[PDB]
Design a binder for this molecule. Structure first.
Ligand code: HEM
Ligand code: HEM
Ligand SMILES: N=C(Nc1cccc(CNCCc2ccc(-c3ccccc3)cc2CN)c1)c1ccco1
Ligand SMILES: N=C(Nc1cccc(CNCCc2ccc(-c3ccccc3)cc2CN)c1)c1ccco1
Ligand SMILES: C[C@H](O)[C@H](O)[C@H]1CNc2nc(N)[nH]c(=O)c2N1
Ligand SMILES: C[C@H](O)[C@H](O)[C@H]1CNc2nc(N)[nH]c(=O)c2N1
Ligand SMILES: [Zn+2]
Lengths: 419, 413
């Protein structure tokens, strides 16, 4: 039993065995493929809330077993006691506690297993901030500020994740309500349009409704909305000297800087769920650095986002009569050129989509040579511009779900009964 | 049971019931997705009976005659034939219906809003390669229509025992030749180098130029394939120029206007039509992104970037991206100027979203392959990018088949 993937530029074939260790459903069947569904499956590893012992322990025994095999100590003295130790905690607390090394292993391996991440060649170079001692929203704000400041590192960005206490009964969850630590506000206008970032309108309204005083500009950094041990969330303002921002200019078009555009330097995903041996860390903000397309193809150019193509085209003097002039395509390129050139000018880490995609091909090779496989989601790996002129477009990929993992989770306002 | 797909740009939600009617593999398992795998002797009497029943039932349902007197007589007729002859023959009505639906069911095709407007040429009376050449010439002339292209397919005799297959050995009816040089370089189209060697061996005397139309290699009834030169007056060609860069014409570039796919298999009710060339018209990016800029292809980015004085030292200047756009602008401007039918990728994807919605309304779903529907450039600024799509295999369908020089056992000398 194998499966081969082939790269149709280079004719390199790769033999995948790692997929035999797949645990969760992808959503597909032999009669239907769901590889372009956003959230295809709802196959979770334990039931919704406080699991019984025979539900939680088998997941724990798997993770510990996997960790001790990783370090060539399977069945060793330490491993056997660790099993017995996790049994006692589950028996007396209906949960258990990860060792500091187990916690680091798991975070790095959830990144490694993130089939959608084009960036995983860095997976083992992740800094882990243990914040499992935290108890309040103020403490969360302290931990998050240190995260942001370490990771920003004056622009030489560093990957980090900060791990808050795990879910216990489902009522005492820790949650960052922000989807990223640094996003811009979006404002519903009287004339029906949208000022700022339309993705965040709803979140911006919850902030205003929670007492935030909006500047009502186009690039207003949003407050943090931190929730600790299930209490009501609390607004904090990130100290601006911690929010690195790049003004976007263009190496050719001098008029570009007059579009009054900037973006933040640190992408810090903060609404996902980290799962390790059946433990669920509902607040695990992680951050690395941007691929240029993320800002310039999606953030600036989606219709339901900043939607700035029309403006950039006008200033370029393009025939916007019909689509066949390819005026969107042209403007779209000049933008991502401008974004790259600006980050590089301010010595802020950023990677282009040719470098990133090439990296990931190399990562694939490494993973197949040393691990027998590497899960990859072609729909998400291929950059959203210039797909076929990058090497991943011609790379076949197998997609399967390995644990530890990052998972989606409901937005907390759909589920939070206030006080 | 139902399934939902969402458009994350518009928030439209469609409900797929049609997926229940599929019964072929996708290659995916319940624990592994093969969505990006490119490609994941003949049927006995027993295997053919149900296949034919499914198709006949579907046809008669389609014309609001299910369970009718004509329906049951046709079904009993098909049975007599499989009993007697171990195969059966489609009526003309069923052949048209089947060929139209295989296009409709082609999950990888973004042009399916046009599916019901398809001209079917019945060529099941054909017996020789000369016969095939005649049929293909009439296909090309009808489809090209002086630049106002019309979709058509020509269907040759179905498979029998596998020993008497009809095959077009060309992958398209009109492609340019490729020639490896002693110094390793390549003249013409690198994609076709192998097929070029085969033709040259079979006796074709090549011009050894950059845009030589390859000869047809036609196999009828399991015999050795035979060479024919498509009459040059039937090959409509477009010289590629750019509306702003006057230096572009000096690249010497041209393309053929008629995409005519000939290496595939058409399956209707268990019958396999191993030779079924079909044609429509181009999306610009097929020539412009893939045919010129793929590195295993004509590979003209560097030359275009040079003439643009682009900074080609570092990727992050995005010279490849910038050059690719201009080449695609030229392709579209060239065809539109010569009034040859073509569709740009924005128009194409827009129409496909419209077609998908209509198909969910009146048919209960529409199988689609995101990995193929999204254009190979500027993906996220076309609406299919944000459109969730279910993939499953309806039949009749088009199908891959092995290249005939891998399996043909030669006859002469
Ligand atoms: C260091 C440079 C990194 C780059 C360039 C990068 C790049 C990307 C990009 C472009 C995406 C697609 C996201 C989108 O388009 O919305 C993605 C997905 C993802 N990345 Fe990475 N990433 C990096 C670091 C990390 C780190 C440190 C982690 C976790 C520790 C991570 C985990 C993930 C996950 C879980 C997803 C899937 C998210 C989802 O399904 O919404 N990445 N990555
Ligand atoms: C009328 C205009 C049409 C347009 C603009 C169009 C567009 C396209 C494009 C761009 C592709 C991807 C091709 C590739 O990337 O290699 C494709 C695939 C395909 N098309 Fe259409 N098409 C048209 C008509 C037709 C017709 C008339 C048929 C058959 C009757 C057909 C059947 C298919 C099939 C079977 C595929 C998938 C091919 C494969 O699996 O390799 N198309 N189409
Ligand atoms: N470089 C980076 N970037 C990056 C990486 C991972 C994830 C993201 C953000 N990804 C969110 C995309 C998304 C996911 C789920 C839904 C969704 C919402 C509600 C229900 C169901 C699904 C919607 C979206 C919006 N497209 C950015 C980065 C951040 C940290 C390290 O690296
Ligand atoms: N507009 C059109 N275009 C179009 C439509 C359908 C199909 C194609 C050609 N599609 C070829 C892609 C392909 C498929 C399989 C393999 C392959 C090779 C070896 C082993 C297995 C598979 C290689 C390729 C080349 N990429 C073009 C068109 C033609 C007729 C009407 O409309
Ligand atoms: C490996 C990968 O599936 C392959 O390169 C695919 C991707 N998507 C494609 N999409 C289209 N339209 N045509 C293609 O040839 C391909 N090739
Ligand atoms: C419908 C489609 O699956 C969805 O819009 C996906 C497509 N691929 C993507 N790829 C990345 N990197 N990010 C995305 O948000 C998406 N969106
Ligand atoms: Zn799948």
């Amino acid at each position: 039993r194998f499966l081969k993937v082939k790269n149709w530029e280079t004719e390199v074939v790769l033999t995948d065995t790692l997929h035999l260790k797949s645990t969760l459903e992808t959503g597909c069947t032999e009669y239907i493929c769901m590889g372009s569904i956003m959230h295809p499956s709802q196959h979770a590893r334990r039931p919704e809330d406080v699991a019984t012992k025979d539900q939680l322990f088998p997941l724990a025994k798997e993770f510990i077993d996997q960790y001790y095999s990783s370090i060539k100590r399977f069945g060793s003295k330490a491993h056997m006691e660790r099993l017995e130790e996790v049994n006692k905690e589950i028996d007396t607390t209906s949960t258990y506690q990860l060792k500091d090394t187990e916690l680091i292993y798991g975070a790095k391996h959830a990144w490694r297993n993130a089939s959608r991440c084009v960036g995983r060649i860095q997976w083992s170079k992740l800094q882990v901030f243990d914040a499992r001692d935290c108890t309040t929203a103020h403490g969360m704000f302290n931990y998050i500020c240190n995260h942001v400041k370490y990771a920003t590192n004056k622009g030489n960005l560093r990957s980090a994740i900060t791990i808050f206490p795990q879910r216990t009964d489902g009522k005492h969850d820790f949650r960052v309500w922000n989807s990223q630590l640094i996003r811009y506000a979006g404002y519903k206008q009287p004339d029906g349009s949208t000022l700022g970032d339309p993705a965040n309108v709803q979140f911006t309204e919850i902030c205003i409704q929670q007492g935030w005083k909006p500047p009502r500009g186009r690039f207003d950094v949003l407050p943090l909305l931190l929730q600790a041990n299930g209490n009501d969330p609390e607004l904090f303002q990130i100290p601006p000297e911690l929010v690195l921002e790049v003004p976007i200019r263009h190496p050719k078009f001098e008029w570009f800087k007059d579009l009054g555009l900037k973006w933040y330097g640190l992408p810090a995903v903060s609404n996902m769920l980290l799962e390790i041996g059946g433990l669920e860390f509902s607040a695990c903000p992680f951050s690395g650095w941007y691929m240029g397309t993320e800002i310039g193809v999606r953030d600036y150019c989606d219709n339901s986002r900043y939607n700035i193509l029309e403006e950039v085209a006008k200033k370029m003097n393009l025939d916007m009569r019909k689509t066949s002039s390819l005026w969107k395509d042209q403007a779209l390129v000049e933008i991502n050129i401008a974004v790259l050139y600006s980050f590089q000018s301010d010595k802020v880490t950023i990677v282009d989509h040719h470098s990133a995609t090439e990296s990931f091909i190399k990562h694939m090779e490494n993973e197949y040579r040393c691990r027998g496989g590497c899960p990859a989601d072609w729909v998400w790996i291929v950059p959203p511009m210039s797909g076929s002129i990058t090497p991943v477009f011609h790379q076949e990929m197998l997609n399967y779900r390995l644990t530890p993992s990052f998972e989606y989770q409901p937005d907390p306002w759909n589920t939070h009964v206030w006080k």
